[PDB]
Every structure is written in C-alpha cells, then in structure tokens.
From a paper:
Crystals of [name] were obtained by using the recombinant protein BBA1426–121, which corresponds to the full-length protein except the N-terminal signal peptide. The crystals were in space group P41212, with one molecule per asymmetric unit. In the obtained crystal structure, the last three C-terminal residues 119–121 were not modeled due to weak electron density, while at the N-terminus, also the residues Ala-Met-Gly remaining after TEV protease digestion were modeled. The fold of [name] is formed by two α-helices, designated αA and αB, comprising 27 and 30 residues, respectively. The α-helices are connected by a 20 amino acid loop region; thus, αA and αB are placed in parallel. Additionally, there is an N-terminal loop region comprising 15 amino acids; given that [name] is a lipoprotein, this loop likely serves as a flexible region that connects the folded region to the cell membrane. By comparing with the available 3D protein structures deposited in the Protein Data Bank (PDB) using PDBeFold, the crystal structure of [name] revealed a structural similarity with the antitoxin epsilon from the toxin-antitoxin system in Streptococcus pyogenes. [name] and the antitoxin epsilon from S. pyogenes showed high overall fold similarity (Cα root-mean-square deviation of 2.90 Ǻ) but only 20% amino acid sequence identity. Although there is a noticeable structural variability at the loop regions, the α-helices that in the S. pyogenes antitoxin are responsible for the interaction with the toxin are largely conserved. In addition, the predicted structure of [name] (all the predictions were done before the crystal structure of [name] was deposited in the Protein Data Bank (PDB)) corresponded very well to the crystal structure of [name] (Cα root-mean-square deviation of 0.63 Ǻ).
Author numbering:
A (entry chain A), B (entry chain A): 24 to 118
The structure:
C-alpha cells in the first residue's frame, strides 16, 4: 500500500487533538526513519542518501499546550527533511 | 487519519517484493511502538497496558529469501501482540 500518508493537522486546537497529532507525527517519523535504515541495509551502495536521525532532546516533556505546539513544529520541520528522501528510496527500490 | 493500516503481503514472492514487505512491517511496528510509548507518556495511570518492545536480535541479517521470509514471520507475530493494544489506546485517548 506504499508509504503511509503524513498525518493531517486537526481542525480543533484542543490539548487532546494536538497531543494526538504530536503522537502521530512522532510515530510517522519513526516509520520513515525505520524504512530508510532498513532500505540502506538491503542496498548499501556509497550513493545511499544522508539523513538526520530525529533528536528527541529537541522535544519539550511538560504537556503544556504551548510545549505541544512547539514539538509539533519541530516534528513537522524534521518530516520536511526526511519525507522526500524516504519517497525517493521507496521508488528506487520498488522499481 | 487514524492509525496506519498494517502493510499488505505482496502477491509476488520475489526477493524484492518480500524485502520491501519486511521493511514496511519493521516500519509499521516502529510506528505502533512509538504511538504506544508517546501515549503512555501523556496518560501514565498504572492501568496503562503492558507491551513487548520488538527484539531486533530475532531478525536474520543475511538477505537470503529464506531469512527474509523468516523475519516476515517474526514481525507478523509481533504485530499480532501489539496492534490490538495500539488500537485500544488510540480509541481510549481520542474519546
């Protein structure tokens, strides 16, 4: 069924909507990172693209609506780095 | 968009079809595990269900069609342990 879709942002900016969205984004990053690491293992030519592993030290741990919104930003910025690479490696190796 | 769907098994039992399926299954497990760990952090009542973290030492590293098929089995057995828990925690906390 191909790679999973990036989670969609809730309409509702409630603590629970945003907390769930943070969890999905973290989970989606881990799917993409795992896919990139496992695909590197199977075809490990020196050409294999370079990716940042997400640094969880950039995530606030305190459950504030403010800290959740800040984490969402950090996760979205990381997705923008790795999603295009994941999608290119998926195509390269499903060819 | 809810939790992602478990990857579907290819029709084709080719090395490439099975290797890609192994990568998706590993990636899907990491999505579910991350979702379970992040959801435990947000609601950490003593009731929170108990899950096995996947042991990558149970995975063969040698790219044999035989070793890939064996890894697929191990990953599918782990999904059967954690998918129902992930789906229940998703509902509990999207309530």
């Amino acid at each position: 069924m191909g790679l999973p879709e990036e989670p969609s942002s809730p309409q509702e900016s409630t603590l629970k909507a945003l907390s769930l969205y943070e969890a999905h984004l973290s989970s989606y990053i881990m799917y993409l990172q795992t896919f990139l690491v496992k695909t590197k293992q199977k075809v490990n030519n020196k050409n294999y693209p370079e990716f940042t592993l997400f640094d969880t030290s950039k995530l606030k741990k305190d459950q504030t609506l403010k800290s959740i919104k800040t984490n969402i930003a950090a996760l979205k910025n990381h997705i923008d780095k790795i999603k295009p690479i994941a999608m290119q490696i998926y195509k390269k190796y499903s060819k």
